Design a protein around this ligand. Structure first.
Ligand SMILES: [Cl-]
Length: 346
């Protein structure tokens, strides 16, 4: 019987850039999907969140349109990748909130992959784990995501964020400030528009004759159609912001990092149009209460936002904003204080 702890993730900066092979800067967080399991003839898993057991024969990787599909996707990608693995029986638990936008799917998928890696001694290298999990999500589950989530869940390192060039996969660990906490605020609001943005961004690269947004300057944008231009302008500005945050962090200039995150949030909200009033409310209030900066994290249109705050004020700021928020919106919002953590493992 083995136990695996697979973290969730928070992207600090570099949103909606990975599908045009731009820069991203995520971190694994100390909220996890936990898996305790042993070998078995079939696949049997009890989910603490759903409070139910779901199982399938190894012979059955048919989609059932339930959380079990995430498990089937991993068995599918391993078979598709020429690996022979057997079943597992176990329990899935942990404190990573389901569907809050902290990558429940990648955390779970990578956790299952790690469980199989250890039980069956597959000796997978870290990059392979990322690629397999991404392929499972993309081709089996059917969600067209970038590499951001999977990379963070596997490569995270305690006390560090990951600067990643999604075109070359070159990365580097950047230290996160000592007494600065990441206040996570889940709006309570658990796709289509993501797909649209992705298609438009891909057409833009082809129009510009480029393979990555990194190779695009603001000047060239005039050659794109109005709508394409509006969206791609955000991507170009975002790539530049990731590099600026990288430099600022290397100097420990948290004040500058915060200002950049805030600028990025309003760019996403006004130009990329992927925010919502619930997220905007949190950002504005967090800033008035002292945050160095705040920004939605993840895809947008709900989910969670983050605020960079002094460690000593994290609880108070979260509590004050939550009380104000619950008087304004009907959702079951929650706040968490997270720190950059190690990737999937024990
Ligand atoms: Cl999620």
């Amino acid at each position: 019987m083995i136990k695996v702890k697979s973290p969730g993730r928070v992207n600090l900066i570099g949103e909606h850039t990975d599908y045009t092979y731009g820069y991203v800067m995520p971190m694994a967080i100390n909220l996890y999907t936990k898996i305790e399991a042993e070998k078995h003839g079939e696949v049997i898993l009890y989910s603490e969140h759903f409070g139910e057991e779901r199982k399938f024969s190894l012979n059955d990787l048919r989609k059932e349109n339930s959380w079990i599909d995430y498990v089937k996707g991993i068995f599918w990608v391993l078979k598709e990748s020429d690996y022979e693995v057997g079943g597992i029986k176990g329990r899935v638990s942990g404190n990573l909130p389901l569907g809050a936008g902290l990558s429940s799917s990648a955390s779970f998928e990578v956790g299952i992959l790690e469980t199989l890696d250890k039980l069956y001694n597959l000796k997978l290298d870290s990059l392979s784990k990322v690629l397999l999990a991404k392929k499972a999500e993309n081709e089996f589950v059917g969600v067209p995501c970038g590499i951001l989530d999977q990379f963070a869940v596997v490569f995270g390192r305690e006390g560090n964020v990951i600067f990643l060039d999604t075109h070359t996969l070159d990365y580097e660990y950047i230290p996160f400030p000592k007494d600065v906490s990441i206040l996570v605020f889940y709006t309570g609001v658990r796709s289509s528009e993501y797909a649209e943005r992705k298609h438009i961004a891909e057409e833009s690269l082809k129009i510009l004759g480029k393979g990555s947004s990194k190779e695009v300057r603001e000047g060239e944008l005039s050659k794109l159609p109005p709508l394409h231009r509006k969206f791609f302008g955000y991507i170009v500005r975002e790539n530049a912001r990731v590099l600026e945050v990288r430099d600022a962090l290397k100097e420990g200039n948290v004040e500058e990092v915060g200002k950049i995150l805030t600028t990025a949030h309003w760019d996403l909200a006004k130009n990329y149009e992927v925010s919502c009033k619930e997220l905007d409310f949190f950002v504005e209030r967090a800033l008035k209460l002292g945050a160095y900066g705040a920004r939605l994290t993840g895809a947008g249109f709900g989910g969670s936002a983050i605020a960079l705050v002094d460690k000593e004020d994290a609880e108070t700021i979260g509590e004050e904003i939550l009380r104000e928020y619950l008087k304004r919106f009907p959702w079951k919002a929650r706040h968490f204080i997270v720190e950059p953590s190690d990737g999937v493992g024990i």
